[PDB]
Amino acid sequence: MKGIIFTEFLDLVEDKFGLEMVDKIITQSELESEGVYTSIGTYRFSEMLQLLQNLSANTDVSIDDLLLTYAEHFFSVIEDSYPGLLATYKDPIEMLASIENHIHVEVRKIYPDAELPTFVVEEKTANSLTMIYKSSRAMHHFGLGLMNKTFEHFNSSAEIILEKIKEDGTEVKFIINKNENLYFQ
Numbered sequence: 001m002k003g004i005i006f007t008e009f010l011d012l013v014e015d016k017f018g019l020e021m022v023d024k025i026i027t028q029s030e031l032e033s034e035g036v037y038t039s040i041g042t043y044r045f046s047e048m049l050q051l052l053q054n055l056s057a058n059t060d061v062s063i064d065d066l067l068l069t070y071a072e073h074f075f076s077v078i079e080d081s082y083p084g085l086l087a088t089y090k091d092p093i094e095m096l097a098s099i100e101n102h103i104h105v106e107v108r109k110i111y112p113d114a115e116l117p118t119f120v121v122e123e124k125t126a127n128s129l130t131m132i133y134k135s136s137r138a139m140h141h142f143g144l145g146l147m148n149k150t151f152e153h154f155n156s157s158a159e160i161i162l163e164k165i166k167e168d169g170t171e172v173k174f175i176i177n178k179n180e181n182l183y184f185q
């Protein structure tokens with residue numbers, strides 16, 4: 001996992017639960033990096049999992065809800081860091097159907113050691129998209145938050161249903177249905 005994921009995450013923990021919560025979840029976790037992260041550094045996901053598990057226990061907010069809220073904030077980091085990549089797309093369904101073959105392809109060019117999930121499109125219409133999410137990290141709600149802000153980036157919204165193929169969350173079917181949309185875009 002890239003260090004930008006760690007720094008933006010603990011910045012949000014500081015922003016919502018105070019400084020002491022950042023020191024708390026770090027002390028509760030056995031971290032090889034001792035809780036010190038840089039944007040260019042590469043760290044194991046087992047460190048982030050400990051941070052999420054400890055934050056969930058201290059706040060009584062589920063890991064999925066914590067990952068969702070963080071993902072919705074991280075999309076703004078994506079908007080401000082790579083606007084030219086987002087400017088390639090005019091439609092949220094088209095952009096989401098291009099994560100595997102284009103978006104995260106470009107991410108690998110930037111970070112060759114990036115740990116990315118896989119998305120497989122099974123059905124695709126103008127306002128609907130069914131994709132299979134696969135990742136040993138089971139961060140489906142991180143992807144759900146980025147999907148939410150993808151639709152909001154294009155002045156739209158969508159109903160997104162998650163069906164866990166494997167109950168551990170490492171394989172999730174995403175059923176995406178864009179809403180109306182009362183004015184021509």
Ligand code: HEM
Nearest residue numbers: 001002005085107114115116117135137139142143146147
């Ligand atoms: C310009 C758009 C995007 C950029 C620059 C981007 C980049 C990244 C980066 C840097 C990571 C962290 C990799 C690591 O720490 O090793 C990541 C992970 C991830 N990305 Fe993207 N991403 C983009 C769009 C999306 C979208 C739209 C989705 C889902 C709809 C998505 C799904 C994910 C997920 C779920 C992860 C968590 C890793 C995992 O599940 O295994 N990404 N992405």
